[PDB]
Design a protein around this ligand. Structure first.
Ligand SMILES: Nc1ncnc2c1ncn2[C@@H]1O[C@H](COP(=O)(O)OP(=O)(O)OP(=O)(O)O)[C@@H](O)[C@H]1O
Ligand SMILES: Nc1ncnc2c1ncn2[C@@H]1O[C@H](COP(=O)(O)OP(=O)(O)O)[C@@H](O)[C@H]1O
Ligand SMILES: Nc1ncnc2c1ncn2[C@@H]1O[C@H](COP(=O)(O)OP(=O)(O)O)[C@@H](O)[C@H]1O
Ligand SMILES: Nc1ncnc2c1ncn2[C@@H]1O[C@H](COP(=O)(O)OP(=O)(O)O)[C@@H](O)[C@H]1O
Ligand SMILES: [Mg+2]
Lengths: 239, 399, 217, 200, 62, 228, 90, 371
């Protein structure tokens, strides 16, 4: 009994179609998220804006809460589907529950939706993975990752997509156990990887920041290039 | 861009050229031509035929024997006419040449020749004078082990009961037939060895080969599976008659699962099944098998044909399992016996450290300790070395 | 003029053929199915025809074609095996076709009668189909007595109980029980084997104890 | 095909006719070219003419010839074809409709198709004895083909053969009418204009 | 209707040799058929009820 | 006989659920011990990278103040089964006010598990250990994708189940103190399973009848680390 | 003339085709005659080499029947499906 | 024999001087050769074997100087053996010289059959070297410890008591340098090299798979110190093909004693291979060939563009950077494609823009997915 299906097991017992979903995630572009001392920062790469393709429309970064933000790496159609579902869920939870939304609940929601969609015949799993950053961890930053197997884990700093093998090791090389003083330092550190992954072009670092109390914050390419120049000065020290 | 014109090529293949390339090109070309000249001058390298050391051979005996004897042709004998038991008149079937009715020379005797017999025959009167040994297939005749593998029973660890059961059938009746005969019991004549790969099956086979005195023949799947139909069955026939020629013999079919596959029809391989049926018929069919003891090892006991597992063909089935703690300590002792190691190595600690590791794993970990040591250039392996090896191999399996 | 003997491996078919060859006093041709197939293009049918011709030339003759499962198999198989088909067809028509063949009796043995042709399993060729079943319990006791005839058994061996333990045993497995009891008596060094040795042999021969069939699904 | 013919002169002819540059450049010679276009667009004709001018030998095997009915036969055919080409001095290997054995196979027998395309790719990748040995591949409608052979270390270049235009129709009509007895008052240009989108 | 009949008649009257294969009878077979044609220069090849192999093309599955 | 559970083998076995057992085998190892002092469970995280929060992998959980759990397998739907167990305890206690017998909790989880060919999906490819205390006895129980379930004294599931089970069987007896059971289980885990104990990959949870609080082990492992 | 078809088969190169040709020549020489080849599938199966080359010779000798010979032929088989459709042609 | 290695490559006076020294020595060889008994042993042996002498096949040896011999006509002859024939060089299947008149056995002819593995014997290993491969330092050490050092220096292992490792698996993305390392280790120790690439052992006949494996290992034993490189072990390794696996596994770790032959296998898809094929007792060294990192990629660029004439402006580092997405084979393709771009513009001396365009085009030769 070979894989050939979603709801059947090979004699080993692993659902290879879930593996195919995770490889479908692997074929997507880079996405590396972190949490800092107080703030959470993100920068997406591989914009590859081709002239008439005005880069704003595709919306590489989506903020779906009073304050929470992420798009989805993989195939973007299911990304926007989970976007609509996240909008509905966050607004409905804020309306119905005695207290507003927390990042843990919404991450569990996404994981459960992915699992429930997967757990049936004739229903394609979302081949999409995401990195969620939220503020209301009792007023503290925390980062989560969601995987098409319907799984959710917590990270101090994680990378998924085309750089998953590389950037993660980069993080394992330099994620300071010292809580990042001057969260702009964490922003420079993450911008370094977000650039170096895509040829450090300086054009696709498209970035968002939230200090775990603020609403959504965005970084324009010039202000991000400021952190890029600081990182270049830090790297030039070896002389 | 316009294509590279001949003038463009000519300009390009120079100018950028150095001030030596012309001379150096003429030098390498002359090197090549004069190397051909050396080859021609030295001529063709001599090809020999093998004439032994000169002092060893010749004497007038060789040429005298050449001019005096007869280079006999080889024939099958057939249909001893024996029209009166006084003028026997045997038929011969000299292969690829002819068939003749012929008589004996003055040397050989009627009791010497039988039907078949692969006789030898003179070249111009076709008289019969030599009894030649029968035809044995060269692949079948090389199948005999000849050189005894160096591993003995004492080099097998943990399998006390399995080795005891195996030696009861394959070794004891040959060594001490009086035990069985004076007690009036017929010993079993077939053993199957089954267990996970790398558990030691072939190893205890080699051990048997050591302690064995009678003829030992090695068989693997590829030996019997020919492309031609019935030829594998033919090989099985030749193998068993060769074994019958010996005064008692052992046959060992490693990887019997290669051909022992159970019969299936609505699908099959069939020809492999035909060879396996010939093997079954030889093992236990019409006519006594003889003093031919049989040993087979397989990684798949269930896959073999049910007729092949049947007692009388595989009387005793021996299971080799992943060793227990004591067995793991014993195999560690056995493998570290040869190695250069520090004295007080607590082998039981590693043995308990081992997960469900086959004996092959123990050999591999010992070799890995040896390699770490030789990489460090130290002449003695240490406990830290063995721990590092244990890790290496277990994480390598874990991947 | 045709007797096909059949049954699962371990009943005694080959033994029956051997006994029939013993107390007959006639020309006996013994062969297996793999002997007939051979490599060359026309030689297998030649072998079958020559065997039958020899049987005629020594008219009181019985041919024991053992392992008929080899040459005999469903015509359309799986095909480069058609040589086996032709040899088998020569056998087929050397049993009943055109010229009759009398005074040449044929015995055949197979374990896989489902595999065989609907042709060489006919009624004109193999008139008698003799089933060899699993030995019944008095049959098992008789078999153990037969094989332990000369092993110097104990004066009290409860063969009936052995038959009760040895369900699903074939006759060869009963002989295996006997020889295993002898070997176990040798391990004890006992000059005569007894009932406990037979129980231990039954444990040795029987099976693989299956597995955890409540974990199963 | 003048543009296409010029590209294929460059890539094939230059290493075979003037290897010294690639020695002076040091770079290893390019191995082969894939040819793709609608069926009938002179691909075999172009390969045959290139082999004729380059003075090296022409060996052909269509992809459909490779398949066979038995496992281990496509591999043997490819390996012995490469042996023949190597034994035949400077040579170009031509394989028409290579897409027949190079296509979407991940759908899932099919085993021998992969064991053939992988073997061909192994023969060309190992640059086996590629002293003046070249290969040429032809495909109808490139899209059905797979990238496994076009991967950079493998076969190096692609050439497109669109349907002949008005000027190309003029040539081909002239060439194939050169032997036919034509009559004054003929107006072949109207004929070429009247045949839009011919495949040659 | 006489499709093979007239072909046979033509083969008899002319110096041609008449080789026939029916479409129900892979590519190696076609290669051998045309090669066996090549052995006799004026020989004729005939495909009987060809349509089975020459059916309209599309994306083939198996 | 490959498309699903609704096909029977010649030997009757369904060629779908044995693959779910092997799916148990691909998961992280998990251990459970039943003693008259307290019921304990242990689990290996397989923390892919320490940059993860080790507590994030919920391979050790608390269903309720009297009952904790561990699992091995695909993990993803194991959390769903824990959710069902928690809703079971909540509903039954809020309605009847009598404590849910851990036997009954396992029975309810089994009733959920029997919903792949028994109505109108696929078996939950994961196995579970439950450890609980109740007014009538402290118990430990085991659950597998087939929906069958058994009371055990010393249980092990997941990868390396056989060797860990053998050692756990050899160390067990009926009158052990929970301290000796915990130490034996931990040293077994150290020798066979991965490596020396540390807070970022091992987890332990134990429950006692008179204790409805802190059914976990957390931020106190140091004493063991120096004294294991 | 009665024939077990497998009897036609011989291992020498091209001997079986000669055997079939000679059989039909004996048929023509000793009229009136009836040729009964039985178990035809043995040499009449759908298209190991020599059997096909011999079926070709059987086809040629069969088609060589002029209207005048007093020669007729019977073929018997138990698996007519396996028979080559070449024989099935009128 | 072959000419020595000339290892300046730029056209300089040093290269010419080395070639001139080679020229001088070869000219002295010319001079020496141009500048220019055992008739009793000849008249004895080479006249007993009176010309012509036929060639046949030895079947069996029955007595001390009597053997059974076949010939091309297929006949069989029992004929004596004259004393000068080396007995230990005589075995069944051996090609043997025979006196034309009385078929006397007059010498073994060194084998000229079994042509498949005969051509399989590479002997053309010297195209690569450890120098030619750059950056595989850990893998170089692994292969050295595994296959090379036991062949070059078995002394350490015999002194220590280790039976050295004698089977290795190489795995990683294609074009990372697996075959390169295999050929390089074949060159560094001059033990003969045998290659057989995966699916080519798969055959239509029932026999030729296991038979091919058997004769391959037989010839490997015959050459004694030998390397058997199973490239694309995948195709066989991932009943008949399983039987070929069984024969290969038995020939790796089975009965008899295998001897000195080393076995190196290469795969792209290690995780898919059958666990039996990777016998942890036998396949004790698994070696990963990951995609080259920055230092490696620099080394590969240096070695491959070294033989190239270069302009001043090339910014080699900026060529490397990126996110290590290209293996060594892709880098060689970059080098060749940049050379072609330079040639198109008529530069016999490549520039930076050539490499930039080359890398951009080669990277364009990747991926097909839209979202
Ligand atoms: N009824 C019986 N009486 C005596 N001995 C028996 C009996 N049944 C079986 N045996 C013994 O068991 C064996 C039976 O095997 P036998 O040679 O008859 O082949 P078989 O059962 O027909 O097997 P196969 O079909 O594989 O050839 C013999 O060794 C015989 O001594
Ligand atoms: N009980 C044991 N004692 C000593 N060495 C062993 C034992 N079991 C296995 N080995 C070692 O592991 C290897 C196992 O090979 P083996 O299992 O005989 O191959 P196969 O599985 O093909 O029969 C042998 O080379 C042997 O050296
Ligand atoms: N430009 C051309 N000039 C002359 N003849 C042509 C031209 N293009 C095609 N042809 C004719 O049409 C045929 C094209 O064959 P080809 O394109 O190789 O077919 P396929 O596309 O199936 O490979 C040639 O044999 C040639 O005779
Ligand atoms: N580390 C390296 N050093 C030098 N060349 C390399 C390296 N890695 C790959 N190559 C290039 O790749 C080719 C070898 O690819 P390889 O990985 O051996 O093929 P395969 O994937 O079929 O084993 C050679 O032409 C070589 O130039
Ligand atoms: Mg029998």
């Amino acid at each position: 009994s070979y894989d050939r299906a979603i709801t059947v097991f090979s004699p080993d017992g692993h659902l290879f179609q879930v593996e195919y979903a995770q490889e479908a995630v692997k074929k997507g572009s880079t996405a590396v998220g972190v949490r800092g001392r107080d703030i959470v920062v993100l920068g997406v790469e591989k914009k590859s804006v081709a002239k008439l393709q005005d880069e704003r429309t595709v919306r590489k970064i989506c903020a779906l809460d009073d304050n929470v933000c992420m798009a989805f790496a993989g195939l973007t159609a299911d990304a926007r589907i989970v976007i609509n579902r996240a909008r509905v869920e966050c607004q409905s939870h804020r309306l119905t529950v005695e207290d507003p939304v927390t990042v843990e609940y919404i991450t569990r929601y996404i994981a459960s939706l992915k699992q429930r969609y997967t757990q049936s015949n004739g229903r394609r799993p979302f081949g999409i993975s995401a990195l969620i950053v939220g503020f209301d961890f009792d007023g503290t930053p925390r980062l989560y990752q969601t995987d098409p197997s319907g799984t959710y884990h917590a990270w101090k700093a994680n990378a998924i997509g085309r750089g998953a093998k590389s950037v993660r090791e980069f993080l394992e090389k330099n994620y300071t156990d010292e809580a990042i003083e001057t969260d702009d330092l964490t922003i420079k550190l993450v911008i370094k990887a977000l650039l170096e992954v895509v040829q450090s072009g300086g054009k696709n670092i498209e970035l968002a920041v939230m200090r775990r109390d603020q609403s959504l914050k965005i970084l324009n390419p010039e202000e991000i290039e400021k952190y890029v120049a600081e990182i270049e000065k830090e790297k030039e020290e070896n002389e | 861009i316009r294509a590279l014109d001949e003038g463009d090529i000519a300009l390009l293949k120079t100018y950028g050229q150095s001030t030596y390339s012309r001379q150096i090109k003429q030098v390498e070309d002359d090197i090549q031509q004069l190397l051909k000249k050396i080859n021609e001058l030295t001529g063709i390298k001599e090809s020999d035929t093998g004439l032994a050391p000169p002092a060893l051979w010749d004497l007038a005996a060789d040429k005298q024997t050449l001019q005096s004897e007869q280079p006999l042709q080889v024939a099958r004998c057939t249909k001893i006419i024996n029209a009166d038991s006084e003028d026997p008149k045997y038929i011969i079937n000299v292969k690829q040449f002819a068939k003749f009715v012929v008589d004996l020379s003055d040397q050989v005797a009627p009791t010497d020749i039988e039907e078949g017999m692969r006789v030898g025959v003179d070249r111009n009167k076709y008289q019969i004078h030599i009894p030649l040994p029968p035809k044995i297939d060269p692949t079948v005749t090389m199948m005999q082990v000849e050189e005894k593998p160096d591993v003995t029973y004492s080099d097998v660890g943990g399998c006390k009961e399995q080795i005891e059961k195996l030696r009861e059938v394959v070794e004891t009746p040959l060594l001490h037939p009086e035990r069985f005969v004076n007690l009036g019991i017929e010993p079993p004549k077939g053993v199957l060895l089954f267990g996970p790969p790398g558990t030691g099956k072939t190893l205890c086979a080699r051990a048997v080969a050591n302690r064995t005195d009678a003829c030992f023949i090695r068989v693997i799947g590829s030996e019997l599976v020919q492309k031609y139909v019935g030829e594998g069955a033919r090989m099985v026939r030749e193998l068993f008659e060769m074994a019958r020629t010996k005064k008692a013999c052992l046959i060992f079919f490693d990887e019997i699962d290669a051909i022992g596959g159970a019969r299936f029809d609505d699908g099959g391989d069939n020809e492999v099944q035909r060879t396996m049926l010939e093997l079954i018929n030889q093992l236990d069919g019409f006519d006594p098998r003889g003093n031919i003891k049989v040993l087979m090892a397989t990684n798949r006991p269930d896959t073999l044909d049910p007729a092949l597992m049947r007692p009388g063909r595989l009387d005793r089935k021996i299971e080799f399992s992943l060793p227990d703690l004591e067995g793991r300590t014993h195999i560690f002792k056995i493998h570290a016996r040869s190695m250069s190691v520090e004295r007080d190595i607590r082998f039981e600690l590693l043995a308990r450290l081992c997960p469900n590791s086959t004996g092959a794993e123990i050999r591999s970990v010992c070799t890995e300790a040896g390699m770490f040591a030789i990489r460090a250039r130290r002449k003695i392996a240490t406990e830290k070395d063995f721990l590092e090896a244990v890790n290496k191999v277990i994480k390598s399996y874990a991947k | 003029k045709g007797v096909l003997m059949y049954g699962p491996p371990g009943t005694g078919k080959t033994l029956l053929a051997r006994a029939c060859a013993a107390q007959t006093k006639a020309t006996f041709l013994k062969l297996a199915g793999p002997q007939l197939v051979q490599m060359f293009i026309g030689d297998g049918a030649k072998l079958v025809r020559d065997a039958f011709a020899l049987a005629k030339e020594k008219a009181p003759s019985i041919i024991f074609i053992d392992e008929l499962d080899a040459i005999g198999t469903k015509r359309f198989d799986s095909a480069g095996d058609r040589e086996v088909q032709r040899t088998m067809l020569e056998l087929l028509n050397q049993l009943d076709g055109f010229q009759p063949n009398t005074q040449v009796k044929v015995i055949a043995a197979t374990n896989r009668v489902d595999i065989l042709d609907p042709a060489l399993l006919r009624s004109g060729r193999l008139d008698r189909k003799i089933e060899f079943p699993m030995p019944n319990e008095e049959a098992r006791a008789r078999i153990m007595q037969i094989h332990s005839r000369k092993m110097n058994v104990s004066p009290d061996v409860n063969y009936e109980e052995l038959a009760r333990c040895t369900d699903d045993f074939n006759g060869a497995q009963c002989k295996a029980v006997c020889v295993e009891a002898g070997m176990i008596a040798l391990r004890r060094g006992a000059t005569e084997l007894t009932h406990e040795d037979y129980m231990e042999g039954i444990l040795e021969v029987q099976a693989k104890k299956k597995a955890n069939l409540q974990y199963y699904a | 095909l003048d543009k296409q013919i010029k590209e294929i002169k460059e890539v094939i002819e230059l290493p075979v006719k003037h290897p010294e540059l690639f020695e002076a450049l040091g770079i290893a010679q390019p191995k082969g070219v894939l040819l793709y276009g609608p069926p009938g667009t002179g691909k075999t004709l172009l390969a045959r003419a290139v082999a004729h001018h380059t003075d090296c030998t022409f060996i052909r095997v269509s992809g459909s010839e490779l398949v066979q009915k038995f496992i281990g036969e496509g591999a043997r055919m490819v390996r012995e074809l490469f042996v023949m080409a190597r034994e035949h001095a400077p040579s170009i290997i031509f394989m028409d409709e290579i897409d027949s054995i190079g296509s979407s196979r991940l759908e899932g027998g099919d085993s021998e198709v992969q064991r053939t395309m992988l073997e061909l790719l192994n023969q060309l990748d190992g640059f086996e004895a590629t002293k003046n040995i070249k290969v040429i591949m032809a495909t109808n409608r490139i899209d059905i083909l797979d990238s496994a052979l076009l991967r950079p270390g493998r076969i190096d270049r692609k050439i497109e053969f669109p349907p002949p235009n008005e000027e190309a129709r003029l040539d081909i009509l002239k060439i194939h009418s050169r032997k036919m007895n034509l009559t004054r008052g003929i107006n072949l240009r109207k004929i070429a204009e009247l045949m839009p989108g011919a495949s040659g | 209707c006489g499709k093979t009949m007239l072909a046979k008649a033509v083969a008899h009257h002319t110096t041609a040799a008449f080789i026939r294969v029916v479409g129900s009878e892979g590519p190696r077979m076609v290669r051998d058929v045309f090669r066996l044609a090549k052995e006799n220069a004026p020989a004729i090849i005939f495909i009987d009820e060809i349509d089975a192999i020459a059916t309209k093309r599309f994306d083939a599955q198996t | 006989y490959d498309r699903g559970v609704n096909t029977f083998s010649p030997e009757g076995r369904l060629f779908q659920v044995e693959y779910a057992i092997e799916a148990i085998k691909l998961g992280s190892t998990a251990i459970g011990i039943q003693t008259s002092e307290g019921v304990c469970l242990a689990v290996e995280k397989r923390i892919t990278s320490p940059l993860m929060e080790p507590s994030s992998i919920e391979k050790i959980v608390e269903i309720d103040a009297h009952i904790g759990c561990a699992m091995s397998g695909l993990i993803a739907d194991a959390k769903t089964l824990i959710d069902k167990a928690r809703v079971e305890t909540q509903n039954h206690w809020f309605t009847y006010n009598e404590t849910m017998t851990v036997e009954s909790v396992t029975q309810a989880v089994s009733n959920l598990a029997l919903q792949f060919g028994e109505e109108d999906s696929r078996p939950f490819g994961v196995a579970l250990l439950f450890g609980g205390v109740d007014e009538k006895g402290p118990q430990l129980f085991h659950m597998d994708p087939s929906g069958t379930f058994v009371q055990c004294d010393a249980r092990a599931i997941g990868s390396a189940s056989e060797g860990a089970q053998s050692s756990l069987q050899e160390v067990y007896h009926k009158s052990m103190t929970l301290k000796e059971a915990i130490k034996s289980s931990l040293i077994i885990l150290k020798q066979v399973m991965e490596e020396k104990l540390n807070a970022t990959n091992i987890e332990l949870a134990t429950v006692q009848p008179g204790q409805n609080f802190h059914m976990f082990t957390k931020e106190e492992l140091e004493e063991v680390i120096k004294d294991i | 003339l009665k024939v077990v078809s497998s009897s036609i088969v011989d291992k020498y190169i091209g001997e079986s085709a000669r055997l079939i040709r000679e059989m039909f020549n004996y048929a023509r020489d000793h009229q009136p005659c009836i040729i009964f080849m039985d178990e035809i599938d043995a040499i009449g199966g759908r298209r190991d080499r020599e059997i096909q080359r011999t079926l070709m010779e059987l086809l040629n000798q069969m088609d060589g029947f002029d209207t005048l010979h007093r020669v007729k032929m019977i073929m018997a088989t138990n698996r007519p499906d396996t028979l080559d459709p070449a024989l099935l042609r009128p | 024999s072959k000419l020595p290695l000339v290892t300046p490559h730029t056209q300089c006076r040093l290269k010419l001087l080395k070639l001139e020294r080679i020229k001088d020595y070869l000219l002295m060889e010319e001079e020496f050769i141009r500048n220019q008994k055992q008739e009793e042993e000849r008249s004895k042996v080479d006249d007993l074997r009176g010309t012509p002498m036929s060639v046949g096949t030895l079947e069996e040896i029955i007595d001390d100087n009597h053997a059974i011999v076949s010939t091309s006509v297929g006949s069989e002859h029992y004929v004596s053996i004259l004393s000068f024939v080396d007995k230990d060089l005589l075995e069944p299947g051996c090609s043997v010289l025979l006196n034309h008149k009385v078929h006397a056995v007059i010498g073994v002819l060194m084998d000229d059959t079994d042509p498949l593995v005969t051509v399989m014997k590479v002997e053309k290993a010297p195209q690569e070297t450890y120098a030619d491969i750059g950056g595989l330092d850990n893998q170089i050490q692994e292969i050295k410890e595994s296959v090379e050092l036991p062949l070059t220096h078995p002394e350490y292992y015999e002194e220590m008591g280790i039976k050295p490792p004698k089977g290795v698996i190489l795995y990683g993305p294609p074009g990372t340098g697996k075959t390169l390392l295999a050929k390089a280790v074949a060159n560094q120790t001059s033990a003969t090299f045998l290659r057989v690439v995966g699916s080519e052992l798969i055959q239509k006949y029932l026999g030729d798979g296991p038979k091919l494996v058997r004769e391959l290992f037989r010839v490997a034993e015959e050459h004694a110190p030998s390397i058997v490189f199973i490239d694309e072990i995948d195709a066989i390794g991932t009943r008949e093909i399983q039987r070929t696996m069984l024969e290969l596994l038995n020939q790796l770790d089975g009965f008899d004693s295998r001897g000195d032959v080393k076995v190196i296998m290469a795969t792209n898809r290690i995780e898919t291979l059958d666990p039996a094929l990777i016998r942890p007792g036998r396949i004790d060294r698994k070696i990963e060939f990951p995609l080259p990192d920055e230092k490696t990629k620099k080394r590969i660029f240096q070695i491959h563009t070294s033989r190239m004439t270069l302009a001043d402006d090339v910014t080699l580092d900026d060529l490397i950077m990126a996110k290590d997405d290209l293996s060594g084979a892709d880098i060689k393709a970059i080098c060749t494609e940049a050379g072609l771009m330079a040639l198109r513009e008529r530069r016999m001396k490549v520039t930076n823009e050539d490499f930039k365009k080359s890398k951009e085009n080669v990277l364009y030769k990747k991926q097909e997915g839209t979202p």
